[PDB]
Amino acid sequence: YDRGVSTFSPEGRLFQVEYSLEAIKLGSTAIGIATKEGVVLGVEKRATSPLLESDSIEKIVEIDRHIGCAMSGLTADARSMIEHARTAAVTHNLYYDEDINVESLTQSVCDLALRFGELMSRPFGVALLIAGHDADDGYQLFHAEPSGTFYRYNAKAIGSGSEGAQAELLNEWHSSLTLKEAELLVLKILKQVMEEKLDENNAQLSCITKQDGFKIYDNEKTAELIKELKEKEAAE
Amino acid sequence: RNNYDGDTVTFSPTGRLFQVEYALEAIKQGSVTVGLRSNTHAVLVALKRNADELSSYQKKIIKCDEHMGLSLAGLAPDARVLSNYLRQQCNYSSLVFNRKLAVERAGHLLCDKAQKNTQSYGGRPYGVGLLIIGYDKSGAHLLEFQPSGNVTELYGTAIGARSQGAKTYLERTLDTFIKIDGNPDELIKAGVEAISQSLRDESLTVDNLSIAIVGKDTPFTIYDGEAVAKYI
């Protein structure tokens, strides 16, 4: 291009960073919800063709037994962020004989985001929901972007549906929600903003609990939950 | 501005460096934060900003040693970079010389670190402003860091959006708060008032207020949340 990759715009924003934010707006949706019983991550798979085997769509991944991650945007850009997080979480355990804190692991990922210039050539085109549990700040959910910044959210949705989906979460989330309540509640908001009718094949659920860590729900489990939602709604 | 703002290595035909100026614009969109000092303590007050009703409040204050810390307004990552470099220097001074790093000298080092990124192609200026406080062998200190590289020692000041309110107030209250010696709660109270002149449709809460103090016999300490109730 003309300017230069590290250039500031006249309003004080890094062009390449804000252009990178647009690609995320085009990404498949992802939502996470926090509860004192655990944290749930769900994603729209959004297969392009019917011949595409929808099982190989991996947009929720494990970082450690206590830290899971959901991605949205140019997902190919996430392989190395995940590789770095998994290395960072394991290294921390090698050096200190203890689990890494969720925020510390989030900060470590965000440090990559700005290592670019003329060292990566361009910012990452993908944002992350990072969900986990540690013994210092309980269950936690973080939103990490290619700006290098990150916030902790009680619930957050990124990608295509986000603007509306986030508006829904702002109405539906409260502090005494249960793990099962947030499961359905995530499935709800997903079908609401997805372009396909939601089933156990274009959506995927997962959670993080203290006792069992990070599990990805298999299609069987999610299906039984989608139905459980169909009946609750409604039922007025 | 048209043809002369694509990098930090081009002067304008009038002598300006737009890349540095646009960096300041990033600070102006940052949230307000205030610093002021007496002869015995130095205080930071910052208004923390959230994104949704569902998000946390972006932290604004960072300890650098037991005697030095700062507040940030602008690109929070760049504060991480700069405050982390400041921790390293404080630490070098401690280890090699058994000497706490003078606030004046941290200021000099910061200026020089930033100036590298206004003569370097392929680099960019820092998009953040820093208020630095500390108690060293010459007493209380407050510094303001600007991405141009310009570091200045003041009695008080404020940076961030709508910061003029507090800045103006501190200019009035000057002769009063310099004299707030041996009473830290009264210097914080002074600061919380100064920062109030910069609110618009918002009042200080336990969730958004953030306060740091340092001084003679008071190691640099940060108050958030319930700790800051005292002052509202």
Binding site: E18, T149 | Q29, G30, K48, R49, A76
Partner: peptide, 6 residues
């Protein structure tokens, strides 16, 4: 408009 600034 956009508060990616602290």
């Amino acid at each position: 408009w956009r508060s990616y600034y602290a």
